[PDB]
Swiss-Prot record:
Name listed for the protein in its UniProt record: Defensin-like protein
Tree of life domain: Eukaryota
InterPro entries: Scorpion_toxin-like_sf (IPR036574)
One GO BP: defense response to bacterium
Subunit structure: Monomer.
């Protein structure tokens, strides 16, 4: 379900504990439109940036 949603590579995932932090870093640093932390198929938390949805 790709191309809109990209993984923030090398993101320190402790920061997913901070409210809105992945969102914030995705917008300001990756110049994406939003971001949220999700678990991947290896059951690891990831910050995922979204360059389409706000």
């Amino acid at each position: 379900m790709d191309k809109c949603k990209k993984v923030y590579e090398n993101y320190p995932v402790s920061k997913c504990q901070l409210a809105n932090q992945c969102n914030y870093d995705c917008k300001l640093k990756k110049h994406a439109r939003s971001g949220e932390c999700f678990y991947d198929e290896k059951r690891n938390l990831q910050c995922i940036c979204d360059y389409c949805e706000y």
